[PDB]
Symmetry: D2
Subunit: 124 residues, 4 copies
Amino acid sequence: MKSFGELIYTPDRAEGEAISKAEKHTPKIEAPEKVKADQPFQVRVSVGPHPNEAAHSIRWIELYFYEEGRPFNPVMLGRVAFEPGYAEPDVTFTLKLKKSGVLYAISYCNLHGLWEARKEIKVE
Amino acid sequence: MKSFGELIYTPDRAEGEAISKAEKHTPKIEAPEKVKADQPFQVRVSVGPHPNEAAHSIRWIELYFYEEGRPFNPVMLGRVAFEPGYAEPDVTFTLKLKKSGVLYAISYCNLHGLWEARKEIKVE
Amino acid sequence: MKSFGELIYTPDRAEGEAISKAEKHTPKIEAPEKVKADQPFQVRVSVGPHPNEAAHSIRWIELYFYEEGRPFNPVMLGRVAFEPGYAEPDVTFTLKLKKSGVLYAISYCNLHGLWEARKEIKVE
Amino acid sequence: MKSFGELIYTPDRAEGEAISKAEKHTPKIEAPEKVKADQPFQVRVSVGPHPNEAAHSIRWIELYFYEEGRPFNPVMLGRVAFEPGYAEPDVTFTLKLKKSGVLYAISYCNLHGLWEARKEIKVE
Ligand SMILES: [Fe+3]
Ligand SMILES: [Fe+3]
Ligand SMILES: [Fe+3]
Ligand SMILES: [Fe+3]
């Protein structure tokens, strides 16, 4: 059968899809490569160009984090939901990290499923 | 008895509370007074200074909108949830409006309940 | 102007609406009148009959609680979101209470807004 | 590096974990093996025994569905969030399916991460 984690469009097989000739679902993560510990910084997450209507939109974005050295992983950092037609799939968070790891962005399209983005962030 | 809508701390009786000597829960809405129709703009919502830990944080922010002339109201625009300790209660949305109305921000504190902010926005 | 809490259709002015000739939005709360402290019980929340499609559904239900004697109120107990067309607006929670108070149910319709239901529960 | 989908504890490597000597995180899905199309049925999802407190609980459960023959997958069916200490990680949904596939349950623990359960459902 198939596992849930396999269902997710990784950014590697995100380019060789027929729907990525019309609309990008893979989230774009804007965030500094290095930050200071306990210091606040911005992370922007956005998807586009994609339609935005009742019948077809990015419904929500999930932001997770793999913390290096944490016993279990990942930690979910935030979740934002967008109203189709009113809100663009574009959001800025403010974060404080203690340790290095990887930011993950998950976008959900009501027609096109779950799309993943990854970004390394070091904490010095 | 008491109705749900009465339970919410309005920004009028938000100043005469004993807990607003230690921490502000009333959301701050940053958004243009006037925008063009169908044109995208930023709305920032933030709460602070408030603690941010497992035992005590702003768990989530809801962004709603009263659309003038819409038969029923309001329209929920977005919802963001923050992980205690990692995410600051500070978020930026991107919106497209068609008609004038009022932005509402609702913050939730796990100890201190529901707090409301209001901001008029005109669409010309 | 108008406050957010006033926008919510109470179950009193829920009967004298023109849309309640076609569809009920006011949640139905099924829960025992009295429970024992720290003891688990079921609470069912449902809305209907209402359409359930992409263009028109109950998007989500929020369950809150006014705890008698708690310094601030209310406590949000749960939140469930339903996929239009697949999930019925019908959910059962399991709760443990320590003190008496009032359960509140909030349903959201993407066309028809926010609807409220109230149910007293005693903890002996 | 590692992909997001790999981070998720499958129910296969869920038994050979040191924390499954103290608490089960893998969701239990109760649902009929076969249902009729467009006909409503119950799906119960629960996690336990697990602690339920501010510092440590199942925060939320996501219910997804792989629809056989659907161009893209999966469809998210529902999402429920539980207040630590008040709500048990136990929820019942009502669903209508049109086509056969697989139900997925994802539980989130604030310490122990993401846990997966799978259940085949036929629509005749
Ligand atoms: Fe799409
Ligand atoms: Fe507070
Ligand atoms: Fe309706
Ligand atoms: Fe755990």
